[PDB]
From a paper:
Four clinical MDR [name] variants, MDR 769, MDR 807, MDR 1385, and MDR 3761, were isolated by Palmer et al., among which MDR 769 exhibited resistance to all the tested inhibitors and was successfully crystallized. The four MDR [name] variants exhibited resistance to all US FDA-approved [name] inhibitors, and the substrate recognition ability is also reduced in these proteases. MDR 769 adopts wide-open flap conformation in the absence of ligand. However, the peptide binding results in closing of the MDR 769 protease flaps as is the case for the wild-type protease complex.
The peptides CA/p2 P1’F and p2/NC were successfully crystallized with MDR 769 in P212121 space group. The CA/p2 P1’F-MDR 769 and p2/NC-MDR 769 co-crystals diffracted to 2.10 Å and 2.30 Å, respectively. By superposing the MDR-substrate complex structures on corresponding WT protease-substrate complexes, the substrate backbones were overlapped in both the MDR and WT complexes, and only minor conformational differences were noticeable in the long flexible side chains. The P1’ group of p2/NC in complex with MDR 769 was the major conformational deviation as compared to that of the WT complex. The results suggested that the static structures of binding conformation are insufficient to explain the difference in substrate recognition of [name] variants. The MDR 807, MDR 1385, and MDR 3761 exhibited a lower probability of forming complex with the substrate p2/NC compared to the WT protease and MDR 769. The p2/NC complexes with MDR 807, MDR 1385, and MDR 3761 were calculated to have higher desolvation energy than MDR 769 and NL4-3 complexes. Pearson’s correlation coefficient between the velocity ratios for the p2/NC peptide and the desolvation energies of the p2/NC-MDR protease complexes is 0.87.
Residue numbers in the entry:
A (entry chain D): 1 to 7
B (entry chain A), C (entry chain B): 1 to 99
The structure:
Amino acid sequence: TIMMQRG
Amino acid sequence: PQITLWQRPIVTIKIGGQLKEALLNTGADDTVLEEVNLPGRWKPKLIGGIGGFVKVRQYDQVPIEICGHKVIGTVLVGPTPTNVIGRNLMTQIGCTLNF
Amino acid sequence: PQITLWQRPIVTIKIGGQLKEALLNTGADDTVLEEVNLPGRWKPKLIGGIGGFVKVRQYDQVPIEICGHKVIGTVLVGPTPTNVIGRNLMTQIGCTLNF
């Protein structure tokens, strides 16, 4: 899994 | 602690009187959980991941316990593959990356 | 470096003889770059995350420099939003979470 998260 | 990453860095978190676990995630701006016991209203928030954009539930000023500290932060509730603690909360526990 | 998390943890990478930058991502098991030019054979892989699944090329035993340090490892290549260094590489450079 690639849990890159932009917010 | 000094956590190596030979495995997912998952810690225990207490939120809404449920023990949850989540991965200390330096590649996420925000904290994102699948389901949490949070009773109140929330605001619509769009987040970006690797495959597209999801709309999530933004709960503000949530009291949360991570690895021994009580912290207040924004917690997002969305379709994340795994529970994730982002930099918004990691900064508050003084978590750094070192190498 | 001791790197704080008040901003994205982005570092220089050196891949296929190109100076690039990438995000140290403790929430990624694998490493994924935007399209770069590599010798070697590739095999296709499907990787997941927020927003669903993306098809990438898996290159094995790839040499790459992360913040100056040479390490060898599996590098994924795909239409990521941003360059991501995963746990697979971060473990080779000695990167730890600290608090």
